[PDB]
Design a protein around this ligand. Structure first.
Ligand SMILES: O=C(O)[C@H]1O[C@H](OP(=O)(O)OP(=O)(O)OC[C@H]2O[C@@H](n3ccc(=O)[nH]c3=O)[C@H](O)[C@@H]2O)[C@H](O)[C@@H](O)[C@@H]1O
Ligand SMILES: Nc1ncnc2c1ncn2[C@@H]1O[C@H](COP(=O)(O)OP(=O)(O)OP(=O)(O)O)[C@@H](O)[C@H]1O
Lengths: 639, 106
């Protein structure tokens, strides 16, 4: 047949050779920079390439040009995806280093040693949308010797693969292959191991620890531990069922260097202190200062604009956990006064444009900064564009810079408005284009400002190591989303403005028909997701942009007005307010002034949220409507 | 700058020749054609040819581009009574000549 190969490292060479010996014609080989696959390719006169992303249109089109019958993947590191895979009529097969569906993850060579398996093997399966799930075309078992280590098991596997391909490859050349599907309810998956995963925890059994040192023995990074401040690596181990009433982690002897484990002791045969040379355990013991003795505050969150809608709710949330200390500054304090007595809450009434000593000192002193000061009520974009620009953009750019100056993590609040009039069904943080209108449509000044800030934060991240996370709220609402008073000037979001209407007995106006829709998110859902981001479990939020909204609560403004009215009519306090003045369609210009333009639909992709936070919106819209309505109605003084 | 009749106040004006639309590939050909006919041609090495490349390998990660760009020159006509005149090929020649005579030959 005619094929295009994706190979790298050892398996890559033996695979390209088996492929050649089997009579295949290799049109091209895709590999990586740094047995060299490239060297082999060059030696055999096979055009070799090493782009960063072969999934790029140009490559896909060029691979399609070669018109391959089948595609093979022998330890290719980057990920080849569907688009190109299906360019081969005979299919695409990948050679995985484990007994699938077991250890279908990555680094199976090491994991099988970590978990101390008795056997492993090689598997040639078909490539499908799911990683390592495709139908198995051939497999082959391998026995793991009690004294095998990563490198030695690697050759075992290489040899096994050389044999598996040797015989099952001629089979594919023709078509005698059985797609024995994978027993999905038996598949095990593992992820990339970082050198921090080879840490030795002496409380575990000597056996477990021993397999660890084997799993990552040279040429791998190795298993390590600490002698006080000093870090050392264990290259050779040796389990001793020889008990020792000694507590785990304590040195039983220095010749041999025997450490007491949770079960039995482990003998460090060879290792090295720090980046020094390898030496026998007895010597390593001395160079580390060992004798018979044992081996191996809360988070400050700064919230600017803490009294705001997002601010006060986030404070309540954080103040529930004990590992948080909350520092906040704001112009107002009615929403956070209830926390003033809390020991872990430190509030101060200030202005981001005036109180520099406090702000700078705290960005310097805290661990995470949440710059929530802003003006986010659309009427203000057209009415006071410059005030919006100066506060939303300039004032914040200053905080962003304090953060890079003092190397602090910044969880900056982006906005769903950054997508503008995007046309995708789902506004995607990593793929959607951003669309705004002409310069003569000033409503977008906000959108554009927030986007430039997102881009600056991104550059700082890329070019200066700033640790960040951008989050984009999608029409969050609930109690304290603005206030009826600000609403009297149009300075508030829809929901809270329509409540003022029902309260004062004025009609609910639906700007341009009110057919445009949005995805309303309950503030409780939003704060939970945000809380998760602050938690930043596993650092899965670094450099990430995360939308937060409930795609399930999509509704037109007209529907929002109806749902609100329905609740309002059933409310206990209803009789206190005037009779409904009705819904009335109005030209946007008559409410927002010249220069207004809007978004016809807004629904978020919440994939990233699911991936980084394991978050999912839960509260349904109607409930949010009730909560919000109730809060504001009981804000009205009745006398 | 003249702002005759203040017809440019508060105006945004595109300035381009919608008549000179061309792909970069065509720009490269037109340039090459002129280059081959140029008096100074013999001073420079033989053409190494055209080669398609991934944007990433030239601009780095994070590059994206514009597939087409043509301006409306209504405002220009209305506020300035202006209309592009020079054709692209002439601009190519001018530019090529200038830069070729920028090269020190010795
Ligand atoms: O939280 C959100 O995701 C976004 O909310 C607002 O922007 P937007 O949703 O466009 O505007 P709202 O004031 O919340 O109202 C939505 C739409 O309802 C309509 N509306 C509003 C008020 C009213 O009385 N009548 C009416 O028909 C308007 O067309 C308005 O654009 C903010 O401007 C954004 O910064 C924020 O990201
Ligand atoms: N100059 C300023 N100095 C300090 N705080 C300010 C200043 N200007 C505005 N603020 C504060 O910013 C806070 C946050 O704004 P607000 O609550 O109106 O919206 P938000 O919660 O960010 O809304 P969304 O989440 O919908 O964008 C306000 O409570 C206000 O006190």
């Amino acid at each position: 047949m005619k094929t295009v190969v994706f190979a790298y490292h050892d398996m890559g060479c033996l695979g390209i050779e088996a492929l050649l010996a089997a009579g295949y014609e290799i049109s091209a080989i895709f590999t990586h920079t740094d047995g060299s696959v490239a060297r082999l390719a060059a030696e055999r006169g096979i055009p070799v390439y090493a782009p960063d992303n072969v999934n790029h249109p140009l490559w896909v089109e060029r691979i399609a040009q070669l018109s391959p019958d089948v595609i093979f993947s022998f330890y290719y590191r980057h990920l080849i995806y569907d688009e190109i895979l299906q360019l081969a009529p005979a299919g695409a097969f990948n050679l995985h280093g484990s007994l699938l569906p077991k250890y279908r993850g990555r680094a199976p060579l090491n994991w099988v040693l970590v978990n101390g398996e008795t056997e492993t093997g090689v598997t040639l399966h078909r490539m499908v949308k799911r990683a390592d799930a495709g139908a198995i075309v051939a497999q082959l078992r391998i026995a793991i010797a009690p004294d095998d280590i990563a490198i030695t098991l690697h050759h075992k596997l290489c040899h096994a693969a050389r044999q598996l391909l040797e015989q099952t490859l001629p089979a594919i050349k023709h078509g005698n292959i059985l797609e024995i599907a994978q027993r999905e309810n038996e598949a095990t998956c593992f992820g990339r191991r970082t050198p921090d995963d080879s840490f030795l925890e002496w409380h575990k059994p000597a056996s477990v620890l021993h397999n660890m040192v084997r799993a990552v023995a040279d040429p791998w990074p190795g298993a390590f531990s600490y002698v006080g401040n000093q870090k050392f690596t264990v290259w050779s181990s040796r389990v001793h069922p020889h008990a020792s009433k000694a507590q785990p982690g304590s040195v039983i002897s220095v010749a041999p260097l025997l450490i007491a484990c949770g079960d039995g002791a482990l003998e460090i045969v060879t290792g090295q202190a720090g980046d020094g040379i390898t030496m026998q355990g007895s010597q390593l013991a001395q160079t580390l200062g060992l004798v018979q003795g044992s081996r191996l505050r809360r988070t400050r969150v700064l919230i600017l604009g803490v009294n705001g809608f997002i601010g006060n709710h986030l404070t309540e949330r954080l103040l529930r956990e004990d590992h948080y200390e909350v520092y906040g500054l704001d112009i107002g304090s009615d929403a956070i006064s209830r926390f003033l007595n809390h020991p872990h809450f430190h509030f101060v009434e200030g202005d981001i444009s005036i109180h520099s000593e406090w702000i700078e000192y705290h960005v310097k002193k805290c661990d995470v900064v949440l710059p929530l000061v802003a003006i986010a009520t659309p009427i203000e974009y057209t009415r006071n564009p410059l005030r919006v620009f100066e506060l939303d953009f300039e004032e914040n750019l200053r905080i962003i810079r304090y953060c890079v100056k003092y190397r602090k993590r910044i969880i900056f609040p982006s906005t769903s408005e950054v997508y503008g009039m995007c046309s995708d069904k789902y506004f995607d943080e990593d793929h959607s284009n951003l669309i705004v209108g002409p310069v003569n449509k000033p409503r977008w000044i906000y959108s554009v400002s927030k986007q430039l800030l997102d881009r600056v934060i991104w550059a700082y991240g890329e070019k200066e190591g700033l640790q960040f996370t951008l989050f984009r709220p999608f029409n969050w609402m609930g109690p304290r989303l603005d206030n009826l008073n600000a609403a009297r000037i149009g300075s508030s979001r829809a929901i809270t403005q329509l409540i003022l209407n029902l309260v004062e007995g004025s009609p609910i106006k639906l700007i341009d028909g009110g057919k445009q829709k949005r995805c309303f998110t309950d503030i409780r859902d939003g704060i939970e997701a945000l809380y998760r981001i602050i938690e930043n479990a596993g650092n899965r939020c670094d450099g990430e942009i995360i939308n937060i909204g409930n795609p399930e609560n999509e509704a037109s403004i007209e529907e929002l007005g109806e749902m609100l009215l329905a609740s309002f009519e059933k409310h206990p306090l209803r009789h206190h307010f005037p009779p409904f003045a009705g819904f009335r369609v109005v030209e946007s210009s008559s409410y927002y002034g010249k220069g207004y333009q809007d978004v016809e639909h807004r629904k978020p992709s919440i994939r990233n949220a699911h991936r980084c936070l394991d978050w999912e919106p839960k509260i349904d819209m109607q409930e949010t409507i009730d909560e919000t309505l109730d809060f504001f109605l009981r804000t009205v003084d009745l006398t």
